[PDB]
Design a protein that fits this description.
- The protein is an alpha+beta fold.
- The protein has one domain.
- The chain is 13% helix and 31% strand.
- Strands 3-4-6-5-7-2-1-8 form an eight-stranded antiparallel sheet.
- A hairpin with a 2-residue loop joins β1 and β2.
- The termini are close together.
- Bound molecules: ligand I56.
- It is found in: Mitochondrion matrix.
Amino acid sequence: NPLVYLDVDANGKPLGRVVLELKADVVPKTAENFRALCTGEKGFGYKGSTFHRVIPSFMCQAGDFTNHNGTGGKSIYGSRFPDENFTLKHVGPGVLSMANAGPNTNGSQFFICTIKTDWLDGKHVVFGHVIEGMDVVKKIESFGSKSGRTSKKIVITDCGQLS
Ligand SMILES: Cc1cc(C(=O)O)ccc1-c1ccc(C[C@@H]2NC(=O)[C@]3(Cc4ccccc4)CCCN(C3)C(=O)/C=C/C(=O)NCC[C@@H](C(=O)NCCOCCN)NC(=O)Cc3ccccc3CNC2=O)cc1
């Protein structure tokens, strides 16, 4: 299971680092997409993009590096790739899962849960977990609102692979 990181700021002020373990032992294709989008090694990826939809007591969503609003993103494999499996569940805060627009629409957008989102089980592919920096996730959450609109611009200023 690779480890990756996101460094995040709010209106240009650093919030800190989120470290994520990707469950490549369960969803290796989904993990590999996210890993490569963190490193940028395919020529596109998360660096410079935002947490565009942040809803307290729900989740923090990011990864739309094409349209910055929840309508875009793409995978390293092409526009979409299928739901690899639904083996892992949305068991609590800190779960990392793929955003989608219905079956088999995984691209780049992802979310970090701030509550157990069990109503998403079987609908979104869970593929990793926060290992370090859950406090940074809670900081991101604090910059959200009910509609999802953020009170500050939340930017992934750097990201990459740790192991
Ligand atoms: C890469 C790709 C390729 C192809 C292809 O090549 O063909 C086609 C499509 C994609 C693709 C496109 C978009 C996404 C992200 C997805 N974009 C959206 O859907 C839209 C609509 C859209 C769909 C397709 C294309 C353009 C626009 C754009 C952004 C804002 N839109 C809609 C939303 O906000 C959606 C919210 C929503 O569905 N509301 C339901 C309730 C809510 C919940 O559980 N609420 C309960 C809260 O309780 C808390 C306790 N009280 N569920 C949720 O939020 C569900 C959810 C969960 C986690 C993360 C994201 C989402 C919503 N998905 C989005 O954001 C992803 C992939």
